Write a protein that binds this ligand. Structure first.
Ligand code: HEM
Ligand code: HEM
Ligand code: HEM
Ligand code: HEM
Lengths: 146, 141, 141, 146
């Protein structure tokens, strides 16, 4: 995906302020709460009975950190997302069989979490740049379906 | 279906929007136009630039329709019937676009109401906007 | 919303299915499993190979549920309430998958009922299956 | 997209029997009837007031022939759909701004039309091969969004 230099700047500047220990877990937790069918893939994570249970679940926070790591990795390779996500594509598509619509959903939940954390700093043009990124990541993760 | 807790959550969150109702609606539209440029083509008679009086005025209309839906949440097909006719028949709005505007409304609320946008309320608001979207796409013939 | 003509069209087309009801349901499932392999994971206790007695038996269940929906087309949320609970709560079926099975049901009807599958009836059947899908995805909590 | 030789065989064999003067118009007409918002892009085609009006409209039949031609072209280049649809991608995405979900819908309408015309010959495995094709075409036409 192609970001303008202004967009790249906006994206990288905000990402440097991201709490990498927490934001991924918040996004994964919210995915599980807002789109409850996604819990089907996380039976081994234990208590997902309430939103509080989900958000406070140590496995959700831990797995969310790995997800965010992958987004960070994609941000460093915007011109080669397919190669970057090849192994994860094989995992999520060939092994897990997650419908790729859910890749889009998690990306949009991440965008909501960024808006929540950054407030007015997450301006409409900053969002538009992040939408390009999370779309690129979703398409790359879905490559094994293509 | 919206649960009792969902209706309580949506009413509370939307209650906090207040005199900013029109403003947030305009911001959600701008977010949509910039993030998802395909949606721009519905508004050729609009100047979609920042600070556009037309986008500001239209944001108030969107907000008023959502407020009507909140106020009549148990009777939304009836409350939004005229708007459903408009969007589906006259305007022929692609159903995908309601998901795009709904996402941008969530982002707008998250950016303005950090205390209200809990995971549970995020879920309730998503269900509410999906319900509104279901009504507004119900009249394709 | 389903129009009077839609309900007439669906009743007529489904009327032609007859004693093949269960058979066509099983065929639609097979079409779905082969075309969209992600859907297979919902049925690990099923052998999904051709001629599977389990797919045959399940196709009859799907057909009976659709027949119930046709017979109670003005009261579908109530008629399908138990099935909505099952698919959304217990089974956690991804909403995308209902679009996939609906498409495969249309393909199955097209392949078997060439005289019935006019453009107007295709449209009515699509709206009907979308309505069924809306009810079956209405209970995520 | 990768078809097995058995799938390629099934696809090519059926396509040779396709009426290339009619099937494209039937698919485009049905798109306009079943998904009426798509009529927004065809205001200049005249009478679209009834299903009969749509299906009998000479412009719908004529434009459908061009669509089918593009699918035929894609069938001949399954290993390079992106290059094959580059110009059409620029048209449909950059110029027309058609949401790419509608590329998927038209492909699925085409699959319905093939089932209608071929009946029991359009077996579940033949369908599965055609779903790979129309997915590939939709993804290629959507490349300018990626
Ligand atoms: C942009 C979207 C996504 C990204 C970047 C992502 C990233 C990741 C990463 C980094 C891992 C860890 C892999 C490893 O341990 O080496 C993982 C595992 C996993 N993902 Fe995701 N993921 C995404 C979407 C999803 C979605 C939507 C679901 C289900 C709804 C899902 C289900 C899983 C599961 C079940 C695992 C554990 C697999 C295992 O441990 O064997 N992923 N993902
Ligand atoms: C939450 C969802 C939505 C709500 C509550 C909403 C509400 C409204 C309202 C209240 C009006 C003015 C009605 C009137 O003045 O008679 C309107 C008009 C309009 N809407 Fe929406 N709408 C929604 C989604 C969308 C989407 C997704 C699109 C397209 C991407 C869209 C395109 C339009 C257009 C083109 C007009 C006419 C503008 C004009 O000609 O002045 N709407 N909408
Ligand atoms: C037109 C849409 C659908 C209809 C009418 C339908 C109908 C049914 C019926 C009647 C049953 C049996 C209920 C019972 O025995 O208590 C059932 C079970 C089930 N359905 Fe569906 N269904 C639909 C869509 C789907 C989809 C899209 C999926 C997944 C891709 C799905 C997955 C399942 C599963 C996994 C079961 C349980 C099977 C078992 O454990 O034996 N359904 N459905
Ligand atoms: C797989 C999907 C599709 C294929 C293969 C396809 C193919 C084509 C072709 C071959 C043309 C003629 C281009 C030329 O004259 O050189 C065309 C034009 C056009 N298409 Fe499609 N199309 C697809 C989907 C769609 C959809 C879904 C829409 C709208 C709902 C659409 C709207 C149009 C319009 C409005 C034109 C006329 C453009 C012009 O003459 O300037 N297309 N398409």
């Amino acid at each position: 995906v192609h970001l303008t230099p202004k967009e790249k700047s906006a994206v990288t500047a905000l990402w440097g302020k991201v709490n990498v220990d927490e934001v991924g877990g918040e996004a994964l937790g919210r995915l599980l709460v807002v789109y409850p069918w996604t819990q089907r893939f996380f039976e081994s994570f234990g208590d997902l009975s309430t939103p509080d249970a989900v958000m406070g679940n140590p496995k959700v926070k831990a797995h969310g950190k790995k997800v965010l790591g992958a987004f960070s990795d994609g941000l460093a390779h915007l011109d080669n997302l397919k190669g970057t996500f090849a192994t994860l594509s094989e995992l999520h598509c060939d092994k897990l069989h997650v419908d790729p619509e859910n890749f889009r959903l998690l990306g949009n939940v991440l965008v909501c979490v960024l808006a929540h954390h950054f407030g007015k700093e997450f301006t409409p043009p900053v969002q538009a740049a992040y939408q390009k990124v999370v779309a690129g990541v979703a398409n790359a993760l879905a490559h094994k379906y293509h | 279906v919206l649960s009792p807790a969902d209706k309580t959550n949506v009413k509370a969150a939307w209650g906090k929007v207040g005199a900013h109702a029109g403003e947030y609606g305009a911001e959600a539209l701008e977010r949509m136009f910039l993030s998802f440029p395909t949606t721009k083509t519905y508004f050729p008679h609009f100047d979609l630039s920042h600070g556009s009086a037309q986008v500001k005025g239209h944001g108030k209309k969107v907000a008023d329709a959502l407020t009507n839906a909140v106020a009549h949440v148990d009777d939304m097909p009836n409350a939004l019937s005229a708007l459903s006719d408009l969007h589906a028949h006259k305007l022929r709005v692609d159903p995908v676009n309601f998901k795009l505007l709904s996402h941008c409304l969530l982002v707008t609320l998250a950016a303005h109401l950090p205390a209200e946008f809990t995971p549970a309320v995020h879920a309730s608001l998503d269900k509410f906007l999906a319900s509104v979207s279901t009504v507004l796409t119900s009249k394709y013939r």
